[PDB]
């Protein structure tokens, strides 16, 4: 018949090749589709949904795991005190593991874009406070003062009727994309820290409770992308699923 020659790649099974296989049922016709709500077409639609960040990931909270979703604020005695600090890379081990952005970034290798963090205040109406939420590009470690942490991208938050503020994390990076940071040589993809400070104080009248809690939410912006699908290390099968 036709003269042909076979090349390398014959009789291999690559698990990702997009081929045409032979059918098993000639004349089949599937069940007609109906309008099921909530259809999804990219995974970037789900990465833009705010989910709860676990800033309070302590070793003392692992027996009562519901406390990891909240950080307490209180009436202070010193002025300008550090409240919490956490890194801003979604694919690293830490507070970003509880988010749907973090759990879907670990299915990919590289990422690029801006992130937003929304802090909600769950205190009383008679409470009054101001906080400073800062973001520091890579360099040294966490600062010791807020006179050092004010030199970065910072947002002055005032409590009131609008009980949420949004801190954006800008895309400040050397490269166009950014692989996932670890403790080693892959730490030239670090994104920096996010610190919360007391701007003035947390002030309550008599009768109001002197400790309130803040829940943190995190999602992605519109210029967020992902690249190079991989397999997560968050799922681990040990023996067998009966």
């Amino acid at each position, epitope marked *: 018949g036709i003269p042909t020659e076979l090349k390398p790649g014959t009789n291999q099974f690559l698990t990702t090749d997009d081929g045409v296989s032979a059918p098993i049922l000639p004349g089949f016709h599937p069940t007609p589709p109906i309008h099921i709500p909530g259809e999804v077409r990219n995974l970037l639609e789900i990465c833009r949904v705010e989910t709860i960040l676990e800033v309070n990931n302590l070793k003392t909270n692992e027996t009562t795991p519901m406390q990891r979703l909240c950080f307490p604020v209180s*009436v202070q*005695s*010193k002025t300008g005190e550090l409240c919490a600090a956490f890194r801003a890379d979604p694919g690293r081990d830490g507070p970003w593991q509880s988010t749907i952005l973090g759990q879907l970034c670990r299915y990919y290798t590289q990422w690029s874009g801006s992130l937003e963090v929304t802090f909600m205040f769950a205190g009383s109406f008679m409470a009054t406070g101001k906080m400073l939420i800062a973001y520091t590009p890579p360099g040294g470690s966490v600062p010791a003062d807020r006179i050092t942490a004010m030199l970065g991208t910072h947002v002055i938050w005032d409590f009131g009727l609008q009980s949420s503020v949004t801190l954006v994390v800008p895309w400040i990076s050397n490269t166009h994309y950014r692989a996932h940071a670890r403790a080693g040589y892959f730490d030239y993809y670090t994104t920096g820290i996010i610190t919360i400070w007391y701007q003035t104080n947390y002030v309550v009248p*008599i009768g109001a409770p*002197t400790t309130a809690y803040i829940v943190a939410l995190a999602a992605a912006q519109d210029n967020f992308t992902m690249k190079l699908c991989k397999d997560t290390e968050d799922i681990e099968q040990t023996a067998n699923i009966q």
Partner: antibody, heavy 117, light 108 residues
Framework: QVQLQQSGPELVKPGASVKISCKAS????????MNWVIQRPGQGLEWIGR????????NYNGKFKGKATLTADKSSSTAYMQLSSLTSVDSAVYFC??????????WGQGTTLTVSS | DIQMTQSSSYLSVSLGGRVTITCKAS??????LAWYQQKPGNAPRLLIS???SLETGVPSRFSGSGSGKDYTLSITSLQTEDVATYYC?????????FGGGTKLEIKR
């Protein structure tokens, strides 16, 4: 190690004035409050006033406003308390304490002052 | 002006026992109470801060508690270097009022 060292004892006539020093050491002096506590013999312990040596502001007790006045010299790391119009009820022991988180964590040695003619 | 009452001024128990020193306030002080110990002659030494926490250097015989407006310092068990006057201090409002002082003595 952080230590506070006050001046020695004094003894003055009724109507005079004294100046008690309190030298701090081993500490960032201009960024913490320095308090003063009076102990009359031998039952009580009461607050007088505090001072922030960085900007120089002072907060007095209500029953020691016109009698005590506080300054601070950051070039020597030394606080001062000038008690004026000294009378017979002003015979007590005057302490010098610093404030860490609202409480007094470190105290001085305790200078004593007697007023008699 | 939060008057803070410490009753009573004298109490006496022997060695190896249990002391309980009470201090009652007038307004809510938000657990911002501190305990001091003053031996006769020297300066006061801070033992408890925040009605629960021990300072670095004091032993585990001291342990404080309290909820509401009444508070408690407990020494278990009492040694011979622990005989001194004990004061409570309120640092929630100014003037930072001290207590009356409960002197400890020996029972024989």
């Amino acid at each position: 190690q952080v230590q506070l060292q006050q001046s020695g004892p004094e003894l003055v006539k009724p109507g005079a004035s004294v100046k008690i020093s309190c030298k701090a050491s081993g500490y960032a002096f201009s960024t913490s409050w320095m308090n003063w506590v009076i102990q009359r013999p031998g039952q009580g312990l009461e607050w007088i006033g505090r001072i922030y040596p960085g900007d120089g502001d002072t907060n007095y007790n209500g029953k020691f406003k016109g009698k005590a006045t506080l300054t601070a010299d950051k070039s020597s790391s030394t606080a001062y308390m000038q008690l004026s119009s000294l009378t017979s009820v002003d015979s007590a022991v005057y302490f010098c304490a610093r404030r860490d988180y609202g409480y007094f964590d470190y105290w001085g040695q305790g200078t004593t002052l007697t007023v008699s003619s | 002006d939060i008057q803070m009452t410490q009753s009573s001024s004298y109490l006496s128990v022997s060695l190896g026992g249990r002391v309980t020193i009470t201090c009652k306030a007038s307004d809510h002080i938000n657990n911002w109470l501190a305990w001091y110990q003053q031996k006769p002659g020297n300066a006061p030494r801070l033992l408890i801060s925040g009605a629960t926490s021990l300072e670095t250097g004091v032993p585990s015989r001291f342990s404080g508690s309290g909820s509401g407006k009444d508070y408690t310092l407990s020494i278990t068990s009492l040694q011979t270097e622990d005989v001194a006057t004990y004061y409570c201090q309120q640092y929630w409002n100014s003037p930072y009022t001290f207590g009356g002082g409960t002197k400890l003595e020996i029972k024989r």
